[PDB]
Amino acid sequence: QPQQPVPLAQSLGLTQDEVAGALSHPMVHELARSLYGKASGATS
Amino acid sequence: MREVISIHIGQAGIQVGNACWELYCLEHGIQPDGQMPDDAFNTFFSETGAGKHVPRCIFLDLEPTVVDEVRTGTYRQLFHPEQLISGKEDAANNFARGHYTIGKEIVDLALDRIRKLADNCTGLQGFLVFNAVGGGTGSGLGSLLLERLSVDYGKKSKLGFTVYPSPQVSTAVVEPYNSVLSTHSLLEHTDVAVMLDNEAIYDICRRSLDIERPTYTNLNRLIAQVISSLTASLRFDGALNVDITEFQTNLVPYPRIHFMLSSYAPIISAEKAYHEQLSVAEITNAAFEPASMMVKCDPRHGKYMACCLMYRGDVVPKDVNASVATIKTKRTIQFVDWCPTGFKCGINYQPPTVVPGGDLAKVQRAVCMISNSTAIGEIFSRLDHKFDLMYAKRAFVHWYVGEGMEEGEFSEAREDLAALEKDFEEVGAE
Amino acid sequence: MREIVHIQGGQCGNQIGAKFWEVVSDEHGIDPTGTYHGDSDLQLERINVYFNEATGGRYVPRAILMDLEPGTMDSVRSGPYGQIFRPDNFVFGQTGAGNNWAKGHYTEGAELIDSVLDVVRKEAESCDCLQGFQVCHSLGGGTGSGMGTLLISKIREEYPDRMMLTFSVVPSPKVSDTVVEPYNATLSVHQLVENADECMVLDNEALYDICFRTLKLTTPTFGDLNHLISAVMSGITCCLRFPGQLNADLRKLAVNLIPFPRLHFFMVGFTPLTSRGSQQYRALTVPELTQQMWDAKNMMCAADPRHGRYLTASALFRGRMSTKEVDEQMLNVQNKNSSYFVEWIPNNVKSSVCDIPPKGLKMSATFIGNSTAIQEMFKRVSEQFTAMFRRKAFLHWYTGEGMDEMEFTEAESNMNDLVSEYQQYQDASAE
Amino acid sequence: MREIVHIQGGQCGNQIGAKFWEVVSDEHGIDPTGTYHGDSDLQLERINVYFNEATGGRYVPRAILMDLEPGTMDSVRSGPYGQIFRPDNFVFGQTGAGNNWAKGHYTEGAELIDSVLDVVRKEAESCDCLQGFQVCHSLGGGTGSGMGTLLISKIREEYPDRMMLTFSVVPSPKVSDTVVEPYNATLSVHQLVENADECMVLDNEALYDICFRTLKLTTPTFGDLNHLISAVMSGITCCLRFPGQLNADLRKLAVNLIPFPRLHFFMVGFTPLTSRGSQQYRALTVPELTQQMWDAKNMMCAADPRHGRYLTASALFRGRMSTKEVDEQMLNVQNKNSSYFVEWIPNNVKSSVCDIPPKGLKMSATFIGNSTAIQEMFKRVSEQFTAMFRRKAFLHWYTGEGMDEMEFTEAESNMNDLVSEYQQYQDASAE
Amino acid sequence: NDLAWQPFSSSLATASSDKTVSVWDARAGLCTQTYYGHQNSCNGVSFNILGTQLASTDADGVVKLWDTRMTAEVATINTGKHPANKSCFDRSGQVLAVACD
Ligand SMILES: Nc1nc2c(ncn2[C@@H]2O[C@H](COP(=O)(O)OP(=O)(O)OP(=O)(O)O)[C@@H](O)[C@H]2O)c(=O)[nH]1
Ligand SMILES: Nc1nc2c(ncn2[C@@H]2O[C@H](COP(=O)(O)OP(=O)(O)O)[C@@H](O)[C@H]2O)c(=O)[nH]1
Ligand SMILES: Nc1nc2c(ncn2[C@@H]2O[C@H](COP(=O)(O)OP(=O)(O)O)[C@@H](O)[C@H]2O)c(=O)[nH]1
């Protein structure tokens, strides 16, 4: 990590409901299912 | 006017019906609540005075769990509660249990609801029976239902999207038994039977979608896309419209020979999408590739008899003609000597809609190739020895006998499958 | 909506059943006072399989406790979940069976069997639909083995079509607890062969081996063995209680497991059993679950599968997993170990998948194997029974209870014939 | 994605393996807790060659730690990287072999070899693709030599095509530690000739030489020798783990090194090993690395290459370097020292280049030389073995473990045949 | 109640009091065929000398002759109400001798 000579949640205006239900969203569930389906190639 | 009644029997039938009906809702804009914010939906949905649309489908199963999953999930305000029919005791992988003892009252109620559904249809293109050959519910109850439908409705075209056991991989042990029984049953009732194999669709997902852990949801989504492509010509206008009745005329040469390999193209993830041109010729070639077949059955072993191609999206007749000419000039693709044309091309102007949450990419073109070819006898050949190997010892036969079957039923089913093998050999031979 | 009637017999059976009910209540979020505290819809979705709703929010097990001495079920009420059971389902005698199968089956078991059947019928009729009965007990004890086999016979008479499942703790090979274990086991096996549709064989020494080698426990009490048995008994029926991607009920398991009616004895195991130190050192994957599942050390039966041949094997997986991954794992296991699998069955695996893993475990898998290896266990029990019967030691205690000597030899003949059938299908060749 | 199964055997083998795993974890940026803390993508790119992922981010070696006494791996666990290893991979007995190869191969090794093979098979089956096994151990010790040779034979039987690499600490020429070193070495070399595909020969006295003459250390403990052995063990396989301008796997090295199957014994050395004083002063260049590696003093083998002839020699360089510079340097070495190189091979050098130098070093290069010089080492070991075997000293300890006297004679004959082949290819003339 | 080997064969026909006459394979141990024609306990069975037909008696006096390969009832005859006990085929003949109470 280079030297640099504020929170991500604060950025983009993410609401507390979105933060709480981030992993509970059906779209995120589908994303997790796809990531699990592509084992070791998920990060490709 | 172009109504088609959908039947989903057993766990596999209901689980592919979930994908099919989600796809239809996405395609026609119908929200899961039941209503959408013309008359292209009439094939699959019947509209009420309130404007809310109910599918013309029937979820039949002897087990409550799968149907209750639908009753509890998102599509609880869409389906008809009585159309969801739930049994009390499962068939326990017993064809006799699903065909002789438990299936009676359930099939009576099923015929009742099917009459009620067909009474609401001006026209009726046919029935789409989605079951699982290899399970007591799907095989036995499905066979009984198909027999009853053949007896009462008569000449209505029943298209059976059956899933036979894979060559090597499987989940059941008595699967050869009940598969042979159900194949005996459905050789004489269904009009066009579409073969599907879990191993082949797993291979398709692993190779084309790059899914190292394919699952039943992915398999059902692929099957749903294929059935949507099959029915697209009923709901959306386009050049070279193809009909349910035209499937049989252009695909079934003789009444016994009506089993069909199905292949969809392209099957590409969005990361691999827009990285190839995806032209009509290339998608036709992919559809004719043996790996793209959804049945573990190499077409190189046999010879093609007929091929119905269903093109979706931005497809032009010049391109379908050029691709089919290249296919005819191709040497590995081999046709029977008695069918010089052997092709039924049909285009549709509606591109395949992409399911959010799916792996398929948004592609402007698609091909669904459904082919009658004599190679399909190979899968019956595999089950014919998988059956007799267990039948020599009469293993698990007491289970089937206990629910009111006889050794004669097994003998007759084996003999009829042997006759089907012989018929496939004879049609393949000159 | 497919109900199961749980029955506990004998001291060992009662303790195992109490631990099983504790585990099931933990899985469904049921406190010992009966109130639901799970905060999950799926826990209450199929609670009626095991429990019934009381006047209030209380949930009561569909359990029937059987014994001839009241001390064991006094301990049952003193147990952590001793209050969930209805007091009317405790059926007890006054003089316990002195490890005497004859006493528990003919003399003292005859009187109490009236109340046992009355309670069983009362619980069965209230059920909408009945999958069947599951009876947990120990072979090699008076009240448990004898009285339980008597109940099993009566229930088979009453409900021939309903499923019968038995969890029998067969006497262990090396270290035997009571002297008359071979006699009681020989007599109970004869009843289980004729009556029980589905039977699981468990051994205390196999449980000790697994809890000392895999779990790496130093001082495992009977509570831990009951814990492992309870895990298996929950996992066998999790498909009824929870949604599954490929579900399979008890009757489906029996159909896919039993080739012939007399070959219905099964050896079971549970995964993932991980030592506490290596819990961070195990990566929870379907191949790892299969590797532990097919290991002979994980089997809770004394007989090791390597000696025999797998006639059939069911694997009920639980958790978020790929059907392709599971199916490929089992096919690959069969292909690698084709020597240990019977040739005249093309596929020897019944794979089922459930979407609800046990609490805390991301994935799990219970294994139910029908293999010819259990032949050697029945052979050892025969080697003990014949040795004792030749000199007729302790035979007078069974004789004084009104049991004819011919009954012992009939039971031995039945068990030897079962051994012969297992050998026949171990060495049967295709075509 | 070409995995390697590491095995450590005996006291010396276990300690060398611990140091090697410390070095590899440092290179891949793995802290003793297993979490990656390296901050370089290429480190994690091919971490699967040695490590597997746990439930968390933990990375654990694919190592199997073998012994008959527990204190050695108690020390291993107490070491700085003791808790990275999977606790299930520690296979140890209760009583160690008293420097008795017979005890480690026949009596006490027989029982534990089943568990060892189970652990090895479990580690191999989890691998996607298996390059092979590497066994680090010491000839001239009871458990080390015995269990190592037995396990190598078993692994050769199970996986014949998979590569086998051995790091054998041959007993030192001048100063021997234990009396029965000649016996153990003679019995182990016979097994290694037949089974081990690729073998590195190491000497404690040769390492002591390099640490006094190149490294100029004062009182170097065994940790330093293990550190240098670990450097060689890492550098031999760094091409698998890191991208290379001209990469070369273990099979490529073996193919280019072994002219005939029995001539698979190799001497190895590492560069640049320099003292602290002249570190600022020494020029870090490809010619300097070549000059150092081709020195006899750089060898970790006691035998000096000047007496023998180089049959083959591989050099694996690490660092952003000129392939022309490397090739020209090694061609120049051949042309200058053509008397030390075999005539009937036009090119006796296999050059491999990797783009990632080891941490701290601007450059590096590991050398693996197949030369007939090791003939004198085997000759000396035979000279000691024959001296003891003529009077049958200490022979009764081995004979009491149930091995024939004939095995000693067969091992000596095989070892002498290997020496004869080395002499034949030293003095072979072209055409 | 009765047992008889099929002539010069490994098949064994056994008649039981369950009103059933079952033909088994001795080597395999499985029931090749079963006949449910009887309405009472089947006292006896007899084979034709060639094995073509099987005569099974009944407690009520019914004697049923079954065909081996057709697996069907060729001839159901009734004696008096008394039980038929055991029967015997004539040596290469078309006659069946039955006992009676
Ligand atoms: N392609 C595909 N096949 C499935 C799917 N789900 C189940 N199957 C197949 O369906 C077969 C059994 O289905 P069912 O008969 O309906 O199972 P069930 O509902 O419990 O009914 P029974 O098993 O007969 O008691 C299995 O062999 C599977 O191969 C699915 O989602 N996709
Ligand atoms: N796993 C387990 N086994 C037990 C327990 N209690 C007793 N046993 C075993 O069960 C065997 C039979 O005893 P049991 O059937 O309970 O005696 P009974 O109640 O008089 O019939 C004995 O050999 C004990 O080793 C227990 O809590 N758990
Ligand atoms: N380089 C190195 N050599 C060692 C070490 N420990 C022991 N040795 C040498 O290895 C030789 C064999 O010992 P070893 O095989 O480990 O004894 P064993 O394990 O009981 O069989 C001894 O003569 C030692 O000189 C070590 O940590 N490093």
Q: Read out DSSP for D54-81?
A: -SSS-EEE-EEEEESSSHHHHHHHHSTT
- The neighbour count for residue C243, using CB atoms within 10 Å, is 18
> What Cα–Cα distance (Å) separates residue E74 from each residue in A34, B153, C86, D141, E54?
67, 41, 61, 86, 10
Contact C201, C374 (CB under 8 A): yes
A 1-44 residues with CB < 8 A to B: 26-27, 30, 33-34, 36-41
- The neighbour count for residue E55, using CB atoms within 10 Å, is 25
Report which of D122, D95, D87 is spatially closest to residue D5, judged by C-alpha positions.
Answer: D122
Of all protein residues, whose CA lies closest to atom 7 belonging to ligand 1? B12
Q: Tell me whether residue C57 is exposed, middle or buried, using C-beta atoms within 10 angstroms of its C-beta: 0 to 12, 13 to 18, 19 or more.
A: exposed
> Annotated catalytic residue: which of B246, B282, B289, B421?
B246
Contact D144, D11 (CB under 8 A): yes
The one-letter amino acid code at D84 reads I
Minimum-distance CB partner of C280 among D58, D88, D122: D58
DSSP conformational letter for B165? P
Measured CA to CA, the distance from residue C29 to residue C43 in angstroms comes to: 7
In the three-class reduction of DSSP (H, G, I as helix; E, B as strand; rest coil), residue C392 is classed as coil
The one-letter amino acid code at C112 reads L
In the three-class reduction of DSSP (H, G, I as helix; E, B as strand; rest coil), residue C203 is classed as coil
Residue C133 structure tokens: 């009965």
Report which of D9, D350, D412 is spatially closest to residue D193, judged by C-alpha positions.
Answer: D412
Q: Which helix (H) or strand (E) holds E53?
A: strand E53-56
> Residue B261 Cα, ligand 1 centroid: separation in angstroms?
20
Q: How far apart are the first and last CA of chain E?
A: 16
In the three-class reduction of DSSP (H, G, I as helix; E, B as strand; rest coil), residue A13 is classed as helix
> What are the two backbone dihedrals, phi and then psi, of residue B348, each rounded to the nearest 5 degrees?
-140, 140
Residues with Cβ within 8 Å of residue B249, at least 6 apart in sequence: none
Answer yes or no: do B214 and A30 touch at CB < 8 A: no
**Which ranges constitute the DSSP H helices of D2-134?**
10-27, 41-45, 71-78, 101-102, 108-126
DSSP conformational letter for B355? P
Q: Which chain C residues contact residue B169 at CB under 8 A?
A: 327-328, 331
Beta bridge partners of B260: B194
Shortest-distance ligand to the CA of residue C182: 2
Resolution of the experimental model, in Å, one decimal: 3.5
Rounded to a whole number of angstroms, the distance from the CA of B167 to the nearest CA of chain E is 29
Measured CA to CA, the distance from residue D378 to residue D301 in angstroms comes to: 12
In the three-class reduction of DSSP (H, G, I as helix; E, B as strand; rest coil), residue B85 is classed as strand
Q: Which chain C residues contact residue A37 at CB under 8 A?
A: 322
Measured CA to CA, the distance from residue D421 to residue D405 in angstroms comes to: 25
Measured CA to CA, the distance from residue B297 to residue D380 in angstroms comes to: 66
Q: Which atom in ligand 1 lies closest to the alpha carbon of residue B10?
A: 16
Radius of gyration of chain A measured on its C-alpha atoms: 15
Contact E19, E25 (CB under 8 A): no
Rounded to a whole number of angstroms, the distance from the CA of B109 to the nearest CA of chain A is 35
Measured CA to CA, the distance from residue C101 to residue C143 in angstroms comes to: 7
Query: Which of A27, A31, A34, A35 should be substituted to probe chain B, the one whose Cβ sees the most B Cβ atoms within 10 Å?
Result: A34
The one-letter amino acid code at B377 reads G
Residue D133 structure tokens: 């096994």
Find the helix packing angle between D204-213 and D222-241, rounded to 10°.
90
DSSP conformational letter for B141? I
Measured CA to CA, the distance from residue E98 to residue E77 in angstroms comes to: 11
Q: Which helix (H) or strand (E) holds D165?
A: strand D163-170
Residue B247 structure tokens: 């499937």
Residues with Cβ within 8 Å of residue C338, at least 6 apart in sequence: none
Contact C67, C89 (CB under 8 A): no
In the three-class reduction of DSSP (H, G, I as helix; E, B as strand; rest coil), residue B136 is classed as helix
Of all protein residues, whose CA lies closest to atom 7 belonging to ligand 2? C12
The one-letter amino acid code at B270 reads A
Residues with Cβ within 8 Å of residue D102, at least 6 apart in sequence: D146, D397, D398, D399, D400, D401, D402, D403
Rounded to a whole number of angstroms, the distance from the CA of A12 to the nearest CA of chain B is 24
Asked if B246 is an active-site residue, the reply is yes
Residue E93 structure tokens: 């003949």
Contact E13, E23 (CB under 8 A): yes
Q: Which chain B residues contact residue E28 at CB under 8 A?
A: 393
Confirm or reject: Cβ of B132 under 6 Å from ligand 1.
yes
Q: Which helix (H) or strand (E) holds D304?
A: none
Complete edge-to-edge strand list for the sheet that includes strand E31-35: E2-5, E11-15, E21-25, E31-35
Contact C68, C147 (CB under 8 A): yes
Measured CA to CA, the distance from residue B47 to residue C315 in angstroms comes to: 45
Measured CA to CA, the distance from residue D424 to residue E88 in angstroms comes to: 92
Contact C286, C325 (CB under 8 A): yes
Residues with Cβ within 8 Å of residue D244, at least 6 apart in sequence: D352, D353, D354, D355
Measured CA to CA, the distance from residue D389 to residue D411 in angstroms comes to: 12
Report which of B267, B253, B350, B359 is spatially closest to residue B307, judged by C-alpha positions.
Answer: B253
Residue D225 structure tokens: 């020798």
- The neighbour count for residue B260, using CB atoms within 10 Å, is 26
> What Cα–Cα distance (Å) separates residue C311 from each residue in B94, C342, C357, C428?
19, 5, 28, 11
As a dihedral over the C-alpha atoms of residue E50, residue E51, residue E52, residue E53, rounded to 10 degrees, the angle is 130
Shortest-distance ligand to the CA of residue C149: 2
Q: Which helix (H) or strand (E) holds C282?
A: none
- The neighbour count for residue E36, using CB atoms within 10 Å, is 11
To the nearest 5 percent, what fractions of chain E are helix, strand and coil? Answer: 0, 45, 55
Q: Which of C168, C169, C201, C381 to mutate to test the pocket of ligand 2 (most atoms within 8 A of CB)?
A: C169
Q: Which helix (H) or strand (E) holds C239?
A: helix C222-241
Measured CA to CA, the distance from residue B40 to residue B60 in angstroms comes to: 26
Residues with Cβ within 8 Å of residue C284, at least 6 apart in sequence: C272, C361, C362, C363, D55
**Which ranges constitute the DSSP H helices of C318-430?**
323-336, 374-391, 395-399, 405-426
Contact C138, C99 (CB under 8 A): no
In the three-class reduction of DSSP (H, G, I as helix; E, B as strand; rest coil), residue B31 is classed as coil
Contact D377, D170 (CB under 8 A): yes
> What Cα–Cα distance (Å) separates residue B5 from each residue in B157, B188, B259, D83?
11, 20, 20, 63
Minimum-distance CB partner of A38 among B210, B356, B357: B210
Query: Which of D35, D48, D55, D62 should be substituted to probe chain C, the one whose Cβ sees the most C Cβ atoms within 10 Å?
Result: D55
Report which of B113, B13, B126 is spatially closest to residue B62, judged by C-alpha positions.
Answer: B13
Measured CA to CA, the distance from residue B360 to residue B211 in angstroms comes to: 11
Measured CA to CA, the distance from residue D77 to residue C22 in angstroms comes to: 39
Measured CA to CA, the distance from residue B322 to residue B320 in angstroms comes to: 6
Contact C106, C401 (CB under 8 A): yes
Residue C317 structure tokens: 């997986």
Shortest-distance ligand to the CA of residue C255: 1
**Which ranges constitute the DSSP H helices of D339-373?**
none
Q: What angle do CA B61, B63, B69 make, to 5 degrees?
A: 90
Report which of B287, B294, B225, B283 is spatially closest to residue B259, judged by C-alpha positions.
Answer: B294
Residue D239 structure tokens: 């091409």
Measured CA to CA, the distance from residue B150 to residue C171 in angstroms comes to: 58
> Residue C107 Cα, ligand 2 centroid: separation in angstroms?
21
To the nearest 5 percent, what fractions of chain B are helix, strand and coil? Answer: 45, 15, 40
Beta bridge partners of D51: D61
